[PDB]
Amino acid sequence: VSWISWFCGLRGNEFFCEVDEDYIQDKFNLTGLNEQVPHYRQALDMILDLEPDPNQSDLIEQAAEMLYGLIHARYILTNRGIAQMLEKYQQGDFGYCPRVYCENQPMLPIGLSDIPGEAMVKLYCPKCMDVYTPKSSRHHHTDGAYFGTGFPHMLFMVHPEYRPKRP
Amino acid sequence: EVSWISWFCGLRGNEFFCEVDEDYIQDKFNLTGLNEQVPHYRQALDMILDLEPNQSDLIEQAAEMLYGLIHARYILTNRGIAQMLEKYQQGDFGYCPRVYCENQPMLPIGLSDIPGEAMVKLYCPKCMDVYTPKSSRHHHTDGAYFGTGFPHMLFMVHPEYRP
Ligand SMILES: [Mg+2]
Ligand SMILES: [Zn+2]
Ligand SMILES: [Zn+2]
B79 interface with A at CB cutoff 8 Å: no
Distance between CA atoms of A117 and B78, rounded to whole angstroms? Answer: 46
Residue B155: CB partners within 8 Å, gap ≥ 6? B125, B161, B162
B131 interface with A at CB cutoff 8 Å: yes
* The domain defined by A96-167 carries CATH number 3.40.640.10: no
Breaks (C-N over 2.5 A) in chain A follow: 53
Sheet with B130-131: list strands edge to edge: B107-109, B121-123, B130-131
Q: How far is the CA of A142 from the centre of ligand 1 (A)?
A: 27
The dihedral through the CA atoms of A112, A117, A122, A124 has a sign that is positive
- The residue ranges of DSSP E strands in chain B, in sequence order, are 107-109, 121-123, 130-131
A103 interface with B at CB cutoff 8 Å: no
CATH code of the region B95-154: 2.20.25.20
Q: How far is the CA of B16 from the centre of ligand 1 (A)?
A: 54
Distance between CA atoms of A41 and A155, rounded to whole angstroms? Answer: 31
Method: X-ray
A118 interface with B at CB cutoff 8 Å: no
Name the β-bridge partners of A123: A109, A132
What resolution (Å)?
A: 1.7
Per-domain residue ranges of chain A: 1-95, 96-167
A99 to chain B: closest CA residue: B131
A76 within 8 A of A82, measured Cβ to Cβ: yes
A130 to chain B: closest CA residue: B98
Helix ranges restricted to H, A76-112: 79-90
CB atoms within 10 A of CB A78: 15
B76: phi > 0 → left, psi -120 to 50 → alpha, else beta; which? alpha
* The domain defined by A1-95 carries CATH number 1.10.1820.10: yes
Find, among A139, A132, A122, the residue nearest to A99 by Cα: A132
User: A144: burial class by Cβ within 10 Å (0-12, 13-18, 19+)?
Assistant: buried
The domain made up of B2-94 has a fold known as protein kinase ck2 holoenzyme, chain C, domain 1 (1.10.1820)
Give the single-character DSSP code of B36: G
Give the single-character DSSP code of A148: -
Shortest Cα distance, chain B CAs vs residue A126, angstroms:
14
